[PDB]
Structures are given as C-alpha cells and as structure tokens.
Amino acid sequence: MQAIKCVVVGDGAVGKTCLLISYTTNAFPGEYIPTVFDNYSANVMVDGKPVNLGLWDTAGQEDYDRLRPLSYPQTDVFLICFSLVSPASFENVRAKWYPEVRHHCPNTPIILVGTKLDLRDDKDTIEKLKEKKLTPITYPQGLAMAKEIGAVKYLECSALTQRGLKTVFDEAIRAVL
Amino acid sequence: NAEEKRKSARRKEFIMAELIQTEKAYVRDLRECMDTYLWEMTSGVEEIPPGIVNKELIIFGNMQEIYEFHNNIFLKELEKYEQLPEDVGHCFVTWADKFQMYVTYCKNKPDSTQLILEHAGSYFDEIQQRHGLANSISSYLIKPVQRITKYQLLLKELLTCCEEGKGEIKDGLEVMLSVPKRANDAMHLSMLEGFDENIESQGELILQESFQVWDPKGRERHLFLFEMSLVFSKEVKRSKYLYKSKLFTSELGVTEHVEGDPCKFALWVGRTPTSDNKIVLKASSIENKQDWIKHIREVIQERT
C-alpha cells in the first residue's frame, strides 16, 4: 500500500480549494465554496494497484514566500494549477510557481492543470476580458507552457461540471508509479 | 433588496459556522498529535533512535502552548459570538499578542523538519503503523502554519458581507494579516549571517524586501528595516544573507522622486544631502515603493 503525497500550488483565484472539494465530495459545493480544506488521505485503486493518496492544499500562502515552501519537502507530485480565464496566473506559472517548485524539489513530477474550463465559452467572461484587451488561454498555449516547464502532463478540469477532474488525480498517481 | 439580504445573511452564517467548525477540528488534530506521537517520545516503551532522544521540544516546538491557548481560551471566545458574526473580529483584537507564539513556531519549522529526516528514521512511521493513524507526523506538524494563514481569508470573506461593525472586522483582519507577515519576516531574518552585533540591540524588524541598489551599477541588496537601523545585506548561495552594511536611521534621509524611472528612490546620510553620495534603490512596483517610503519616513519621525 504505497503512500503518495500530492501538493497543489497556484494563485489565489485559480480555485484549488474547490478543485479539491469537488473531487473528494464528488459534488460541487454549491451556494458556499469552502475556504478551508484540511489535508486529505484516502485509498484509491488505479490500474489494479491500490495506493493511499494524500492531498495538500496551499490556500492562503500566496503572499508568504517563506511560510509557503514548508510543505514542499517530501512531496511525491505537484499540481501547478492556473486559470483559463486569467492570463496573469498563466504568466505567474512560469514566473513564480515553477522556479520555486523546481528549486525546492528538483526531481518531483509536475502536472499542469488549467481550471475553470466551463467559463471559457461564456459570453460574459469573453466580453469582460475584451474590455481589458485580454483573451482566454486556449489549449495550445497551455500545452506549449507545459512543454516549456517540462511538466509531465497538461490537463484541463472544471470543478462545476467535474469534466476531467477525475482524470487529473489518476494521472498524478500514475506519474509516480 | 430581499435577494441581497438573503444572500448576505446566508453567506455570513455559513462563514461563521465554518470558522467555528474548523477551529474545533484543528483543536482535535492538535490533541491527537500530542497524544499519539509526542506521548511515545516522552512516556513510551519503544527504543527511541539515538539521534532524536530528549529532543521533543525541537521536533514539536511550542505546539503544547498553542493547544493550551486554543483549547482553553480562544475556542470559548469564538463560540460566544456564534450568533453575532459581525463582532467576531473583536476576538482577534483582545488576544492579538497571544498569536506571537505562532511567529515562534514557524521559526522552529526548518529546525524540526530536517531532524525528522536526519535522525528519526522509521520511528514515527512505525508509530503510525502501530496506532493505525491516517496522518503522518509532518501532516500534524504543518497544521499551525496552515491555520495561521486561514483566519485572514475568513475575515476577508466576512468583511464584504457586513454592513455594520465593519471597523471591528477590519481591525481583526489587520491583526491577522500582521501576524503571518511577522512570521515570514522572522524566517527571513533567521538566515542573516555575519551580523557583527546583537539582533535585539537593533529593535524589532518592520519590513524586508529585495532591491536593486546603485552604490554611490545596480547590485542586489536585501534590506532589513529595524527600529534603529537599516541593514543592507547581500544574498548568496541555500538562501543566506551576508551582512554588508548598516545605516543609522536618525542620520537617514529620503528622496521620494527620482527622474529617469518611476520605481527609484534615494537614501542619503548626513545633514546635507550631498550628491554623488546617494544610495539609489529600485523598487519592484509603485505600491512597494510607496509603502517603503511611508515606513521609512515613520521610522525617521520616530527617531526624532
């Protein structure tokens, strides 16, 4: 029963807490999105090889460059999460998170996740981004950045509809194996 | 605006309920960590590894102090204002200094963690296997660090939902933003190497940041602003700071506007701000520059 540790790192607006709540509870939070997600651990059966997967959420530690890397030692896999309706997080992926993660953990595998897939086709988000001369991040841009930072796999998920959310953690587990 | 009132009240009740029901879980996890891993080290029967004997204070820090603060005082106060979520920030003002213990805890985190991976071996893993616990030792140890950074988010959520009593929530939010800032400042200061003086002799740290400094080309100099000094230190390879120079704040003077770039500001010493002896520093943003200017001017005013 191998134990695997997965730490999620990203900006505040990426939505990592909801990303984990919707996966663990198998249901979108709904009216209230939780602010606190305690460390998770459960048995997951992947490819006939049961493992014990543990999930670490780093919410609230964005503006603290010394408190944040306290969770990095002894991490089996990282999830670098950005938002598809915010290019600022896409730039901070190569500006802030990847250098720190690769500095503290030179050999830990990384999965590049793009969240909020459901808002990409919205006609309100598109207009609001056009007001600021911004466009949503397409799939090829995410794939190119994943190849840039040497991430194992680029994936897109949606906490609202749970599309691709179950594949992210399965691929993260399979990366370690 | 019936919908506005409904949404505000419902979200406020949800936030207060989460604030109480996560504090309870935090206290429970602290008690379990104290009664499972620490107990074996102190009053156990197994063979402790030679390198971690009599060193439970290093490994667990002052977690017992944090537990006795939360288990005996803080939670009883948070439960009092369950029906008055607008005043919960007051609970963070009376015990403002009581959170200074957290500043200590983080400072011991690099010391403890390495020890577990240097001399503990498979001791705590075997303890977890025997006790059948889901969490490892590090999962329990990291919890105060996470918890100190969760109060600010809940206070921010409550800030946008309250119509009256915004001042109390704002004060609590300021306190619970100051505490992690001090925790990060202390961890940065703990790597200051070569300081040929007393740390406590300079007062308390106020700010720290990395700048580009033109010595009277741009060279990186991490600055530490104490109540009585400003320390310019180089950063060299790990992340350790080499003490390079210091400036007494009483003799210091500030030039806010420097032509050629909006992110540059000058510092000078002596009665007369003579040219060619001006320390030019380039901030990373306008907000950082303004905050540094304000704090340095406050320090100078305090010293006079």
Author numbering:
A (entry chain B): 1 to 177
B (entry chain A): 1282 to 1497, 1503 to 1523, 1528 to 1594
What does the paper say about this structure?
Trio is a large and highly conserved metazoan signaling scaffold that contains two Dbl family guanine nucleotide exchange factor (GEF) modules, TrioN and TrioC, selective for Rac and RhoA GTPases, respectively. Dbl family GEF modules are composed of a Dbl homology (DH) domain that binds Rho GTPases followed by a regulatory pleckstrin homology (PH) domain. The N-terminal GEF module of Trio (TrioN) catalyzes nucleotide exchange on Rac subfamily members, whereas the C-terminal module (TrioC) catalyzes nucleotide exchange on RhoA subfamily members. We found that regions C-terminal to TrioN enhance its Rac1 GEF activity and thus could play a regulatory role.
We chose Trio1284-1959 for this analysis because its molecular weight (78 kDa) was potentially large enough to get a high resolution reconstruction and also because it was the most well-behaved and highest yielding Trio variant. Cryo-EM single particle analysis ultimately yielded a 2.9 Å map, which is unusually high resolution for what ended up being a ∼55 kDa structure (not considering regions that ended up disordered). The final model contains residues 1 to 177 of Rac1, and residues 1284 to 1594 of Trio. However, there was no obvious density for any domain or residues C terminal to the Trio PH domain. Comparison of the complex, which may be the first of a RhoGEF DH/PH module by single particle cryo-EM, with that of the TrioN–Rac1 crystal structure reveals few differences. More residues of the PH domain are ordered in the cryo-EM structure, and the domain is rotated about 4° with respect to the DH domain relative to that of the crystal structure. Density for the N-terminal helix of the cryo-EM DH domain extends outward by eight additional residues, and residues 26 to 31 in Switch 1 of Rac1 adopt a markedly different conformation. The linker region we showed to confer activation (residues 1719–1959) are likely disordered because they all exchange within 10 s after the start of the experiment. However, analysis of the Trio1284-1959–Rac1 complex using cryo-EM did not find evidence for any ordered portion of the 1719 to 1959 region that might facilitate complex formation. We created and purified deletion variants of each span (Trio1284-1959,Δ1772-1784 and Trio1284-1959,Δ1867-1873) and compared their GEF activity against those of TrioN and Trio1284-1959. Deletion of either conserved span led to reduction of Rac1 GEF activity to the same level as that of TrioN, indicating that both elements are essential for the increased catalytic proficiency of Trio1284–1959.
